[PDB]
Amino acid sequence: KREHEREVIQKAIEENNNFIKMAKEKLAQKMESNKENREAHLAAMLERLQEKDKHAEEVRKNKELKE
Amino acid sequence: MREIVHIQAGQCGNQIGAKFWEVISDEHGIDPTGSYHGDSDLQLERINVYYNEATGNKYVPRAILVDLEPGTMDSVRSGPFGQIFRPDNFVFGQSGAGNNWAKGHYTEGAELVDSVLDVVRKESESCDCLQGFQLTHSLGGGTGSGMGTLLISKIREEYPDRIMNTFSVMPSPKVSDTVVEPYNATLSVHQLVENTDETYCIDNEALYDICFRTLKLTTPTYGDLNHLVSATMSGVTTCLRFPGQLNADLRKLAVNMVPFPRLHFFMPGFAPLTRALTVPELTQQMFDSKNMMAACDPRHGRYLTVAAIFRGRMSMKEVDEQMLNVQNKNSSYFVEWIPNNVKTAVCDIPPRGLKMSATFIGNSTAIQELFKRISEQFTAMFRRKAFLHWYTGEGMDEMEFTEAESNMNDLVSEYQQYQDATAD
Amino acid sequence: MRECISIHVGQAGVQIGNACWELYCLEHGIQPDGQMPSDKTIGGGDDSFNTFFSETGAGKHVPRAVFVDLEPTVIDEVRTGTYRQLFHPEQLITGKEDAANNYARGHYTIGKEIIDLVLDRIRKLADQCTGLQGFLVFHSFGGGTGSGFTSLLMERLSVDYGKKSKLEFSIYPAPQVSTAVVEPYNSILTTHTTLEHSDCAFMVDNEAIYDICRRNLDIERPTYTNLNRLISQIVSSITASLRFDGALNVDLTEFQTNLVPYPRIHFPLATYAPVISAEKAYHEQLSVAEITNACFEPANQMVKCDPRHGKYMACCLLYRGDVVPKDVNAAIATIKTKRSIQFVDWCPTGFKVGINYQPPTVVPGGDLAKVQRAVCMLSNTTAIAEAWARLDHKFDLMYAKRAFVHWYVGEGMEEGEFSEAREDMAALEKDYEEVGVDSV
Ligand SMILES: C=C1C[C@@H]2CC[C@@]34C[C@H]5O[C@H]6[C@@H](O3)[C@H]3O[C@H](CC[C@@H]3O[C@H]6[C@H]5O4)CC(=O)C[C@@H]3[C@@H](OC)[C@@H](C[C@H](O)CN)O[C@H]3C[C@H]3O[C@@H](CC[C@@H]1O2)C[C@@H](C)C3=C
Ligand SMILES: Nc1nc2c(ncn2[C@@H]2O[C@H](COP(=O)(O)OP(=O)(O)OP(=O)(O)O)[C@@H](O)[C@H]2O)c(=O)[nH]1
Ligand SMILES: Nc1nc2c(ncn2[C@@H]2O[C@H](COP(=O)(O)OP(=O)(O)O)[C@@H](O)[C@H]2O)c(=O)[nH]1
Ligand SMILES: [Ca+2]
Ligand SMILES: [Ca+2]
Ligand SMILES: [Mg+2]
């Protein structure tokens, strides 16, 4: 009975530590995935705008050639 | 504070832009010298949104004036409230655009854009917490249409996570016969679809029809049209300029109004058009096609979202009841798959002259009628490949014209798609 | 010991917090400067009001509270308002840019920039406690900060304080005073994320509070001020057992043991009476039986739903004022035989009763009549699920078209988080169905 008493108190401690552990890990992975996603969306947006800048160059370059 | 940076490009851009500043300056009680002489503390509560506070208790509009010719900005400097603008914020060239979109967006405009960005950057760096940008311009002319849309792309490149808002004046043969305007409009819409968060469609066709058929003034002037535009611009910015709970900033407005990124072109409305009106009268008129600043019948489509703004001392109980009554008796015209898509604001402070007024902001699928009108005028010329030497000579090819056309055609079909969508 | 720390998040949470702490001060005789003449022990004490108020050497009584918003304008009103001397500057935390009615911004983009600072300030409060009991968290469902930042905070609090109890006061959205079309999104998202981290949550339906103000107080168009003062009376009744002491008093943790049969079934329905104007309370003494009877009138509920069409798993009566057990028991006997009160077969049918002797107080210029006695009923009913169903339906209507979803995806979220949150709400609805079914 003494041993069972030790197991119960230890089990209560473990499940509390595990709850803290799981919540910590889930939050860390969510933050990281969200960071990657949002930066990926910004990168895509900027890249599209970069393409417009390049296109504008080909336009002006195409003008002086035609002259 | 959450500052907004205002940019006005081209003749139409600076014209309606200056009227805007004249009107709201009066509402916030600031004179042409930048001094405040108001009667309510509500006037200065959020004045930092549009104004910078210089020493000596001076209020300077956070505004940037742009054009490829010096003429337009001269009349602005000479006009009332002309001296209130920051002298260094006047950025203009000498060449001009000459109703050529290609010159504004690729040639002349590109050579002046860096000078404009420098000013935008100076203003933006001085902001406690920048909201975003609002641009006034026309889609018919070359500078506002061409360089205006170029400025949007450039600003968005340096401020990717800020809100980009425009007041776009749509061309109409009833007002201007420049002929190449359908081209400049389509090329512009092609840009606006991709790079703006929210655009107020100010339709010159609607403005003329209101002045002629409603206000009963034959041979209307640009003063008459811009009177409606300034009244509209005042209304749609009321929630940004005064203490409020609903749509108090640009991003919250966009989140309530834009369910899909490309569908961000709004139909603005105003009542009454000029005894005072009752709330039932204000409400019914604002949802009326004759009160729309865009030539589109809302009963030819369905509302995705709506923002209503009542101004003046009135019963909020009456407002709530009437707004509910409008949605109930017109449920067919509101998409069922967006619950509670109509939001209402009430500001105690009325506009000048009126005891009370209402401003309408609708994201209606019926806006496709405006684009269809432009598209038909576009294809009427482009199928002939007429007048294309203005643009090809600047380095453009037919490829861009086609893509701009089809993208605008896509936008139209996308409205029809969500118009035809159902819950079951 | 047994301190409680209150956390007020976003506009709704902050403004409701203003109402509660003002009401607390009046109930305990605490002045706006924080002084309390009746408190003879200076610098500290073990009194019941000390669960919510700490004390300085200068005799100031300070709320064990933190206010947090992603924008400044709402909390600035607190900083320069009537009770500005009550709060230490570091208890009031503000950013510059809000969540713009976007859960994603509140939980991620904007929230992550200020979360550590908030946790540091909370830690300072906790270090002053000799026996911290738990947290009371006030927030809206619909707001970007109320939804998004609350979820982040609750998750972080579980990590830093383990299973230390966390109670919620959550403002459920209503069209009469809503400010965003995406509130059903924000509501499902925060409910999913928070469900594992909250031990007990009291939902307040704004539409329910709105109707009660119009009907019972005859207010044509209720403001937040009207709603909040009513909500404060209900919150006060719920925490009265923690802040006062009496021979017939029963702690809130006592009711909580009865109110939460399973971890996920922790959403009590609150009902409060009497709500009545001064004009109508005059010459109108409302007895124990009358206010108790009103608790079973659905129109007096904090959430719109029909308990008469569900099953009870628990029923608690929180009385305050001139109330004796004799009259309470008599009133309960009548109600049992004349009301539609059906219990599940696996729980006892008795009503948990607690009585606090100190009568209700009202704020000056308020709408509520000052009454000799009041009661708050806390019931655990399956009908509360109806509130989930209504939100879930609005969620489904918009999500089937992916409307407004790009606003969330743009801030780094994935559609999988939407479907995952919605699935959890589906399971919650099923859970509430199953607990109601009779035993085999
Ligand atoms: C002339 C002038 C000269 C000046 C032109 C101003 C302006 C502003 C800028 O936008 C462009 C336009 O105007 C462009 O305007 C065009 C030239 C390039 C000019 O080119 C640009 C720029 O010039 C000319 C017009 O389109 C004038 C319109 C045309 O209706 C089609 C005409 C009947 C037509 O003769 C029959 N087929 O009634 C006129 C009706 C309009 O009058 C004007 C006033 C008259 C007009 O102010 C007020 C508006 C509010 C309106 C109602
Ligand atoms: N009862 C009550 N509800 C409120 C109050 N303030 C806002 N709400 C409700 O809360 C919801 C909006 O959320 P808010 O709390 O205002 O937004 P927030 O938490 O500040 O988050 P963001 O502003 O988006 O960053 C709406 O349903 C409002 O009706 C209030 O003072 N009392
Ligand atoms: N409502 C209104 N429309 C204008 C005004 N000025 C020009 N427009 C319209 O703008 C179009 C021409 O664009 P404009 O601004 O003149 O060319 P830009 O200088 O290159 O931008 C025409 O279709 C006009 O009808 C104005 O003051 N008010
Ligand atoms: Ca003491
Ligand atoms: Ca009445
Ligand atoms: Mg807020």
Domains of chain B: 1-259 (3.40.50.1440), 260-366 (3.30.1330.20), 367-424 (1.10.287.600)
CA nearest B160 in C: which residue? C410
CB contact at 8 A, C290 and C263: no
**DSSP code at position A58:** H
B338 touches chain C (CB under 8 A): yes
Interface partners of C (3+ CB pairs, < 8 Å)? Answer: A, B
The answer to whether the Cβ–Cβ distance between B106 and A60 falls below 8 Å is yes
Longest dimension (CA), chain B: 63
On the question of a cis peptide bond just before residue C274, with omega within 30 degrees of 0, the verdict is: yes
The answer to whether the Cβ–Cβ distance between B160 and A66 falls below 8 Å is no
AA identity, residue B47: I
Number of domains in chain A: 1
Q: Where are the beta strands (DSSP E) in B124-252?
A: 132-138, 163-170, 198-203
Where is C429: in which H helix or E strand? helix C415-434
AA identity, residue B298: P
CB contact at 8 A, C142 and C173: yes
C406 contact partners, CB below 8 Å, separation of at least 6? B260, B261
CB contact at 8 A, C7 and C136: yes
CB contact at 8 A, C109 and C411: yes
What phi, psi does A56 have (nearest 5°)?
-60, -35
CA nearest C197 in A: which residue? A23
CB contact at 8 A, C36 and C156: no
C81 contact partners, CB below 8 Å, separation of at least 6? C18
| CA-based nearest distance C14→chain A, Å | 26
Distance, CA of C87 to CA of B415 (rounded, Å): 52
| CA-based nearest distance A7→chain B, Å | 54
Strand partners, B136: B8, B167
User: Closest Cα partner for B245 from C146, C7, C180?
Assistant: C180
Query: Is C254 annotated as catalytic?
Result: yes
The answer to whether the Cβ–Cβ distance between A37 and C162 falls below 8 Å is no
Domain C384-440, architecture per CATH: Orthogonal Bundle (1.10)
AA identity, residue C44: G
AA identity, residue C261: P
Q: Binding residue per annotation — B301?
A: no
CB contact at 8 A, B286 and B308: yes
Containing structural domain, residue A45:
1-67
Q: Residue C7: is it exposed, middle or buried by C-beta count within 10 angstroms (0-12/13-18/19+)?
A: buried
Distance, CA of B246 to CA of B265 (rounded, Å): 20
Distance from residue C12's CA to the centre of ligand 6 (Å)? 8
Name residue, tokens 């996920």: C264
Which residues numbered 406-435 in C keep a CB inside 8 Å of some CB on B? Answer: 406-407
B138, B175, B218, B377, best to mutate for ligand 1 pocket (most atoms within 8 Å of CB) = B175
Q: Binding residue per annotation — B71?
A: no
**DSSP code at position A12:** H
Residue nearest to atom 12 of ligand 3 (CA): B141
User: Closest Cα partner for C170 from C66, C314, C70, C302?
Assistant: C302
Q: Binding residue per annotation — B186?
A: no
C270 contact partners, CB below 8 Å, separation of at least 6? C202, C204, C234, C238, C301, C302, C303, C376, C377, C378
Distances (CA, A) of C361 to C23, C202, C277, C317, C321: 8, 22, 14, 19, 10
DSSP structure string for B66-83: EESSSHHHHHHHHSTTGG
DSSP structure string for C271-290: EEE---BHHHHTT----HHH
Other CB atoms within 10 A of residue B40 CB: 12
| C136: three-class secondary structure by DSSP | strand
| B333: three-class secondary structure by DSSP | helix
Q: Give ∠ CA B117-B118-B121 in degrees, rounded to 5.
A: 80
> The tokens of B44 are what?
């200065």
Distances (CA, A) of B284 to B206, B245, B288, B322, C73: 18, 24, 6, 8, 35
DSSP structure string for C44-73: ----GGGGTEEE-TTSBEEESEEEEESSSH
**How many alpha carbons fall within 13 Å on the CB side of residue C228?**
20
Distance, CA of C11 to CA of B305 (rounded, Å): 24
B177, B180, B202, best to mutate for ligand 1 pocket (most atoms within 8 Å of CB) = B177
Distance, CA of B25 to CA of B33 (rounded, Å): 11
| CA-based nearest distance A58→chain C, Å | 31
CB contact at 8 A, B193 and B158: no
Exactly one of C77, C207, C254, C429 is catalytic; which is it? Answer: C254
Q: Give ∠ CA B120-B123-B129 in degrees, rounded to 5.
A: 115
Which residues numbered 89-108 in C keep a CB inside 8 Å of some CB on B? Answer: 96-98, 100-102
Distance, CA of B269 to CA of B228 (rounded, Å): 10
Best of B394, B399, B403, B407 to disrupt the A interface (most A CBs within 10 Å) is B394
CB contact at 8 A, C99 and C182: no
Nearest to A20 among C108, C159, C413 (CB): C159
Q: Residue A15: is it exposed, middle or buried by C-beta count within 10 angstroms (0-12/13-18/19+)?
A: exposed
**DSSP code at position B334:** B
Q: Residue C96: is it exposed, middle or buried by C-beta count within 10 angstroms (0-12/13-18/19+)?
A: middle
Return the CATH fold of C1-268. Answer: Rossmann fold (3.40.50)
Nearest to A38 among C158, C196, C411 (CB): C411
Distance from residue B10's CA to the centre of ligand 3 (Å)? 8
Where is C103: in which H helix or E strand? helix C103-104
Q: Give ∠ CA C313-C319-C322 in degrees, rounded to 5.
A: 155
The answer to whether the Cβ–Cβ distance between A23 and C197 falls below 8 Å is yes
Distance from residue B325's CA to the centre of ligand 5 (Å)? 20
CATH number of the domain residue A14 falls in: 6.10.280.30
**How many alpha carbons fall within 13 Å on the CB side of residue A41?**
16
C414 contact partners, CB below 8 Å, separation of at least 6? A33, A37
Distance, CA of C51 to CA of C4 (rounded, Å): 6
| CA-based nearest distance B130→chain A, Å | 18
C371 contact partners, CB below 8 Å, separation of at least 6? C274, C276, C281, C286, C321, C359, C360
CB contact at 8 A, C130 and C1: yes
- Helices (H), ranges, B213-315: 222-236, 238-241, 250-257, 279-286
Q: Decide the pairing of beta strands B356-364 and B265-271.
A: antiparallel
User: Closest Cα partner for B404 from B29, B60, B143, B146?
Assistant: B146
What phi, psi does C69 have (nearest 5°)?
-145, 150
User: Closest Cα partner for C24 from C60, C78, C62, C56?
Assistant: C62
Distances (CA, A) of B301 to B324, B332, B360: 20, 10, 16
What phi, psi does C302 have (nearest 5°)?
-75, -20
> The tokens of C296 are what?
């079973």
C269-383: what CATH class?
alpha beta
Indicate the domain borders of chain C. Answer: 1-268, 269-383, 384-440
What phi, psi does B256 have (nearest 5°)?
-85, -20
Distance from residue C6's CA to the centre of ligand 4 (Å)? 20
CB contact at 8 A, C135 and C157: yes
Query: Residues B154, B159, B161, B162: what is their CA dihedral angle, to the nearest 10 degrees?
Result: -90
What phi, psi does C7 have (nearest 5°)?
-120, 125
Where is C295: in which H helix or E strand? none
| CA-based nearest distance C271→chain B, Å | 26
Which residues numbered 193-232 in C keep a CB inside 8 Å of some CB on A? Answer: 196-197
A18 touches chain C (CB under 8 A): no
Q: Which ligand is nearest to the CA of B141?
A: 3
Q: Residue C281: is it exposed, middle or buried by C-beta count within 10 angstroms (0-12/13-18/19+)?
A: middle
Where is C198: in which H helix or E strand? none
Chain B environment of C407 (Cβ under 8 Å): 255, 258
Residue nearest to atom 24 of ligand 3 (CA): B176
C178 touches chain B (CB under 8 A): yes
CA nearest A56 in B: which residue? B106
The answer to whether the Cβ–Cβ distance between A23 and C159 falls below 8 Å is yes
Q: Decide the pairing of beta strands B163-170 and B51-54.
A: unpaired
Q: Where are the beta strands (DSSP E) in C92-230?
A: 92-94, 134-140, 165-172, 200-205
Chain B environment of C400 (Cβ under 8 Å): 337, 423
Q: Where are the beta strands (DSSP E) in B23-152?
A: 51-54, 58-61, 63-67, 90-92, 132-138
Q: Binding residue per annotation — B138?
A: yes
Distance from residue B176's CA to the centre of ligand 1 (Å)? 5
C225 contact partners, CB below 8 Å, separation of at least 6? none
